[PDB]
Subunit: 175 residues, 3 copies
C-alpha cells in the first residue's frame, strides 16, 4: 500500500484497522485520518504543505485529489461524501456535506455543514457557503436551501459508504 | 493484475484474449466486457451496485471512472470512444458515440447513437439526447445534427483505437 | 517504474536523475523531458502519435493527462506549472505559464508565455492566448493582462516545485 512518509511526517490514523484503503490509494505526509474513513482507487492526499484532515465516517471516492498551499489547511468535517474525481485544495468542509463528482473547491473556500455541491461545480477561492445550501454552476451559485429530508440522504450516503468500505476489506479478492 | 472480484461477481469477458487492459487499469465486480474493447491507463470500472456493460470495439481512455447507483445500470453501446478522464455514472449510451475528455454523464441520462459529446460537457440526470446529436456546454445543449462525415469519423475513431490497443499488447515494453 | 517504450521510441531525458518521477507516474513513447521536470502521482504521458515535449523546470502535477492526435505535437515551454488533474491535448504552451488544476487545453491551442489559466478552464481547439494573459472560464475568456508581481509568482511557483521535487526524491519513504 502506498502510504508514504515525507519530511518526517506520516499519515496518522485514529483507527487504522477501521479504514478502507484501496491498493491504488496514496496518503502522504501530514494526513490526519478519522474513524471508518475510506479511500478509494487512485485517490491522492499530498500532505506536504499545510496538513490534510479527514473527519470520521468520511468517504473519499475514486481519484480525488487533496492538496494545500501554505496558509491554507484542508479540513473535512465528519461523515462527508467526496464524489468520484473531486479536487479539494486548501479549503474547509463542514460536517455531513457532499462534494459532487468532478467538483473543484479552491483555497480559502468555506463550505457549511449539510451542504450539497452539485457535480462539476467550481467553488472559487474564498467563496463562503451557508449551512444547508444546494450549490450548482460555473460560476457556483446558491440555488436554494435543502429540506430536512435532503439533509438525511447526506447522512445515509456516509453510512452506506462506511459499510461498503468494510465489505471491500473483507470481500474483494483478485479474480 | 488489477482485475478484482467482489461479493461473488468477477469481470466477464466475451473474448478476453482480444481485450487490451493497461496494467494499472482496474476492473471490479459485475463488469461485462465485449470484444476488442480497450481499457487504458488508470481507468476504473467499479461494478459493485448495478452492472457495467461495455459494448464491443469500445475504447475507455485514461482514468475514466464508471460507477452505478441502484436502479441505474450502466450500458455502453459498441464502437464508442470514451475520452480521457470522462465520468460515466449509471447511464445508457448509443453505439458509435464519442464522449469527450473530461465530460460527465450522470444517472439515468440517455445518449443516442452517433453522438458527439464535447469535452468538459455535463449531461445532467435523466437527460435525453437524440441520435446524431452534437452536444456541448455545462449545462449541456444539443447544438445541431451531424453530417454523414462526422458520424463516419466516429466510426474511424473506434476502429483506430482497436488497432492502437492491440499494438500496445505487443509493442509496449519497459525502457 | 512505469516508464515505457512504445514502437521503438523511448522517453529521452536531457538530464535524468534531475527528474522527479512518482512511482505511479507513466511515461510512454515519444516523450522529451527537460531538466528538473517533475512528474507527480498518477500522471500519464502517452506519446504514441505526435511527440510530447516537456520544457525544463516544469512541474506536472497529480494525474495530469497528456496526449496527441497526428498533426498536433504537444510542447510545453520552460518553467511551467501544470496544475492537478489538467488535460493537455496536442497544444503548445509558452514558457512560465500556469495551467490551473482541472483545466482542459485542446488540439492546436497556443498559450502564450507568462500566462495564468485558472482552474476549471476549457481552452478550445486552436484558441490563441496572448502573452501575459489571465484566462478563466468554460468557454475560456481572456480577462486582462497580468502585472509583473503576478508574473513573478509564476516564476516562483516553478522554482518551488523544482526544490519540492528533489526533496521528494530524498525525503519520501513508505509507512
Ligand atoms: Zn496544489
Ligand atoms: Zn458513484
Ligand atoms: Zn487523446
Amino acid at each position: 500500500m502506498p502510504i508514504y512518509a515525507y519530511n518526517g511526517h506520516k499519515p496518522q490514523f485514529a483507527d487504522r484497522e477501521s479504514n478502507w484503503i484501496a491498493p491504488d490509494a496514496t496518503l502522504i505526509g501530514k494526513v490526519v485520518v478519522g474513524e471508518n474513513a475510506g479511500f478509494w482507487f487512485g485517490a491522492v492526499l499530498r500532505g506536504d504543505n499545510e496538513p490534510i484532515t479527514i473527519g470520521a465516517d468520511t468517504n473519499v471516492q475514486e481519484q480525488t485529489i487533496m492538496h494545500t498551499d501554505i496558509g491554507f489547511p484542508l479540513t473535512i468535517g465528519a461523515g462527508c461524501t467526496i464524489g468520484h474525481r473531486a479536487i479539494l485544495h486548501g479549503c474547509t468542509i463542514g460536517e455531513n456535506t457532499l462534494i459532487g463528482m468532478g467538483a473543484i473547491v479552491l483555497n480559502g473556500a468555506k463550505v457549511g455543514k449539510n451542504c450539497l455541491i452539485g457535480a462539476g461545480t467550481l467553488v472559487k477561492e474564498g467563496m463562503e457557503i451557508p449551512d444547508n445550501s444546494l450549490v450548482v454552476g460555473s460560476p457556483a451559485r446558491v440555488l436554494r436551501q435543502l429540506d430536512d429530508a435532503a439533509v438525511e440522504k447526506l447522512r445515509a450516503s456516509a453510512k452506506h459508504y462506511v459499510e461498503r468500505g468494510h465489505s471491500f476489506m473483507r470481500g474483494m479478492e483478485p479474480a
